[PDB]
Write a protein that binds this ligand. Structure first.
Ligand SMILES: NC(=O)C1=CN([C@@H]2O[C@H](COP(=O)(O)OP(=O)(O)OC[C@H]3O[C@@H](n4cnc5c(N)ncnc54)[C@H](OP(=O)(O)O)[C@@H]3O)[C@@H](O)[C@H]2O)C=CC1
Ligand SMILES: NC(=O)C1=CN([C@@H]2O[C@H](COP(=O)(O)OP(=O)(O)OC[C@H]3O[C@@H](n4cnc5c(N)ncnc54)[C@H](OP(=O)(O)O)[C@@H]3O)[C@@H](O)[C@H]2O)C=CC1
Ligand SMILES: NC(=O)C1=CN([C@@H]2O[C@H](COP(=O)(O)OP(=O)(O)OC[C@H]3O[C@@H](n4cnc5c(N)ncnc54)[C@H](OP(=O)(O)O)[C@@H]3O)[C@@H](O)[C@H]2O)C=CC1
Ligand SMILES: NC(=O)C1=CN([C@@H]2O[C@H](COP(=O)(O)OP(=O)(O)OC[C@H]3O[C@@H](n4cnc5c(N)ncnc54)[C@H](OP(=O)(O)O)[C@@H]3O)[C@@H](O)[C@H]2O)C=CC1
Ligand SMILES: O=C(O)[C@H]1/C(=C/CO)O[C@@H]2CC(=O)N21
Ligand SMILES: O=C(O)[C@H]1/C(=C/CO)O[C@@H]2CC(=O)N21
Ligand SMILES: O=C(O)[C@H]1/C(=C/CO)O[C@@H]2CC(=O)N21
Ligand SMILES: O=C(O)[C@H]1/C(=C/CO)O[C@@H]2CC(=O)N21
Lengths: 245, 245, 246, 245
């Protein structure tokens, strides 16, 4: 139990990567504040983790809401005593051409993937500074490589990376570690949300012929990064499916 | 006159790089639609350009306004007959630490630098597709390199770059050229807007000891890129002050 | 527990630093280790240590810049240990100094060892890795990701290693050969003792004196994490920086 | 004539991009030292340029030869009075898989593309420092993007870029400008040299259905960069064929 007595706040914890990460960190002895919009799914996970001997704090949160963000962080510190690890995992992937796009796709991705992550980072920062803690940014291969029909999604993830590198420069000397996780195709609910029907089906066929990364693989990457000695910042882990060029 | 009979729409044309670019493209024989919020400054530039023999269409526009963007593009095509060149130059640079930041800095930069650019791009695209035209994105060294106290600004510019590369992959085969200009320190009004006083002062001192790039230098980069033969897409020009490591 | 039981790892640059720690780490996971470098005395000492701890060891005197020596070293490893599952291309040298009026033997040495030697080893190992659906680990650097003054040619070799390795990944990944690239920042090893430009050697020492450096063991743990990941996952890049260092 | 009284040394001047660049610079009034191994082709070009009113210095040079490099630079400064522009254009592209590769492909590419370029840069530097001149590195899309069957070639070109950025940091404050040109597919003799037959054929098919960049397009990129005002360093120009995703 490398994380005994530590407090982790995980956004997007109701499914996929965030759910696996919350489990992984709790398994290492961390108290976990689990945040997302689907409260019933969070409660179900919270019950499971509590029944497994973990300390859980359930947070109904929209990361795009600046006020909600500030309250969520304050609630976590109040209920669990501090903040050692923030996992900015909440995100959505809305694929489709730039041409004649539904721009609500764009505003949603920017609010959640970029602004939400930045809001959470900022609110957590005073607490992470005191605990010499770690912020883990859930980026993507989409923050390293551009492919067609993912322009704005890729814009958000490249943006996350630049924000995070800059953040590292700003806070690293005070012992706040900045970790960026960059998964390739991972088998989650993420793709079910694509609003462009033609691209949703194109993407599904594209990834149908590979062994996908599992949510647990990515949780393991986070676990490796956060349990590394404090003098080491695993700033980037770029993990790809072996089957995928 | 390499651009005779062509129409260019330049956002952020009321000062700085956009003003110089509008002059440069007009000098090459292009009809210019000049867009920004300060109508008085646009009118003054429009008068000067018209007095020099250019065809000018003045557009009062906030690029963050989706509806205003659509109307501005439609107004341009109606008044000037089409669209061959879009210069997405409207932008703001609000520097300061992430820690305890004024988050209105962030929303402004994202709305203008990222969302505004993407809105203009999308609205212009049908017209650029017909004319096999060129979209010029005004990025920055901040889209290539991260320094302290520019996290969200750099996020927007790295985002612009990823969006633009992806756009290139999507439209290049149909003859729409995607050009990204990346200036280093350029002597404009840009820095006057920084809301974090300590950072504004720090930045001023940092750039006080170099010969800065001039707005005209960047206009020249744009002119070189857009007058290149159609089979060549000058996708990136990274121009730095020689005095600046 | 032993995630690499029955696997064979060949580690170049095993006589000190990161390669030594990596050979220990892999052996601790149950892998048989072929340890390769030029200082045979140091290899023998490590080999004795590992053998005494219950490991299977094959000692290889090798200059990675030697194309023929490379081929023989791979052949010797597969003959002695039965196959090849993991290659760690760790052999390397860092010769810092300005471009201006540089001692160009600095350059040829770095290119021969860091770039060409790594490529030769990769190529010779590949038929064996293809059969075993194995993993090649490239020891790159922060120098393959960021450029600073007085490390022009070294950074050229490391950026070169990264492009070579990404391209390799595209070529072999579908046949189940995983390409892993490890990118340490400042790590406390013998590496810097070799700098021939005296002024730069001193400048570098002062710059890194103010930080808690990465340990060779930290980097070995990165390698361990990457190679013990399930086969369907290729941890293509791990970029590990000293927390103290902007 | 923006380069009147300037001296340019161009490596790889016997064909392709180097030939076009030597013509373009001479057209701007620069004296040109033209260097390559095929003396006969250099003399024919030298005759052409001299007949057009240019000052020409013919140099038989293998850039992989460190002593030949030193003599070539000394010969140039002796014959033409100094050195204002170096174009490191000599290069070879030997494509093929890593698996079972002919490793003489590798040593040739490293000797010419990387070491030869570095040798030339180093020998020229004292002279460039005096003249506050410009070094132009002929990199490639292969220094920016990795594709299959170009591993070692891409290694040399990514290497050239890192070397050159580092060089910029080291010499830029003393007024030596470092320019990196990155062409995509350009119609030259380059591809005729590929030793791996299957890959040579695969590459030819790949580039058969695009309008390729012309050697003259690349020469124009060099010309734009070197005639920019001294306070501006056009550090990167990334030029892609518009037809090529
Ligand atoms: N799956 C993949 O192939 C890859 C995914 N990623 C990244 O991983 C992250 C997690 O997504 P993934 O697990 O894949 O897919 P999921 O859809 O399963 O997870 C997304 C999670 O984010 C939450 N969420 C979405 N919007 C908000 C919001 N406005 N406020 C708070 N929480 C929100 C969702 O919970 P709820 O709806 O209850 O709010 C959900 O739990 C994303 O950042 C994604 O970009 C990166 C690389 C590869
Ligand atoms: N100066 C520099 O060192 C560098 C600048 N850049 C980029 O260059 C671009 C132009 O900036 P620069 O000329 O330097 O500085 P300026 O402030 O002089 O120009 C910015 C222009 O953008 C306009 N603008 C701002 N917000 C909006 C909006 N929401 N809608 C429409 N127009 C808007 C302003 O006009 P108005 O107020 O009338 O609307 C103004 O004309 C920006 O994209 C910037 O990021 C990139 C690299 C270096
Ligand atoms: N130390 C650091 O801060 C960092 C180092 N690195 C990389 O780590 C790798 C290992 O270096 P590190 O452990 O740091 O320093 P060391 O000097 O301690 O290790 C270098 C190892 O490589 C071997 N070696 C050198 N040249 C050759 C050659 N021609 N043929 C075979 N073996 C050779 C040496 O053994 P011998 O002399 O007996 O042959 C030695 O075992 C290098 O590739 C380096 O670039 C990357 C990031 C940071
Ligand atoms: N064509 C393309 O698609 C692209 C090419 N490039 C780069 O452009 C540069 C020039 O190539 P390009 O013009 O296309 O092809 P060419 O083969 O036509 O030109 C290469 C030139 O380099 C010379 N050369 C080769 N080896 C040496 C050497 N050892 N010493 C001195 N000169 C040498 C050749 O002349 P000689 O045999 O007489 O010595 C020739 O003049 C290269 O660096 C290449 O990597 C970059 C991006 C795209
Ligand atoms: O490679 C993939 O699976 C997907 C992806 C998935 C989630 O980041 O992100 C990038 C954009 C895209 O379509 N890629
Ligand atoms: O280098 C500079 O002058 C400035 C800049 C200016 C406008 O992009 O962008 C980056 C962010 C910053 O502070 N840099
Ligand atoms: O950051 C550092 O400590 C050193 C280094 C060390 C080993 O790669 O590589 C890069 C080049 C340099 O000076 N950096
Ligand atoms: O895109 C291309 O045409 C070629 C190329 C050509 C010359 O650098 O460089 C990259 C490596 C490759 O195959 N690409």
């Amino acid at each position: 139990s490398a994380l005994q007595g530590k407090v982790a706040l995980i956004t997007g914890a109701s499914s996929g990567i965030g759910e696996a990460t919350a489990r992984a960190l709790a398994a290492e002895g961390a108290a976990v504040a689990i945040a997302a919009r689907r409260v019933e799914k969070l409660r179900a996970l919270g019950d499971e983790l509590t029944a497994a001997g973990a300390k859980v704090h359930v947070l109904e949160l929209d990361v795009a809401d600046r006020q909600g963000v500030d309250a969520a962080v304050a609630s976590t510190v109040e209920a669990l005593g501090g903040l050692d690890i923030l996992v900015n995992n909440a995100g959505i992937m809305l694929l489709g051409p730039v041409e004649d796009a539904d721009t609500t796709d764009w505003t949603r991705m920017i609010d959640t993937n970029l602004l939400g992550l930045m809001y959470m980072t900022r609110a957590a920062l005073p607490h992470l500074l005191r605990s010499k803690g770690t912020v883990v940014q859930m980026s993507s291969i989409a923050g390293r490589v551009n492919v067609r029909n993912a322009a704005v999604y890729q814009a958000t993830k490249f943006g996350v990376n630049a924000f995070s590198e800059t953040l590292r420069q700003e806070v690293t000397e005070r012992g706040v570690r900045v970790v960026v996780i960059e998964p390739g195709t991972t088998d989650t609910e993420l793709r079910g949300h694509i609003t462009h029907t033609a691209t949703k089906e194109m993407y599904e066929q594209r990834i149908s012929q590979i062994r996908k990364l599992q949510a647990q693989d990515i949780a393991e990457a986070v676990r490796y990064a956060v349990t590394a000695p404090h003098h080491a910042t695993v700033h980037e882990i770029f993990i790809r499916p072996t089957d995928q060029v």
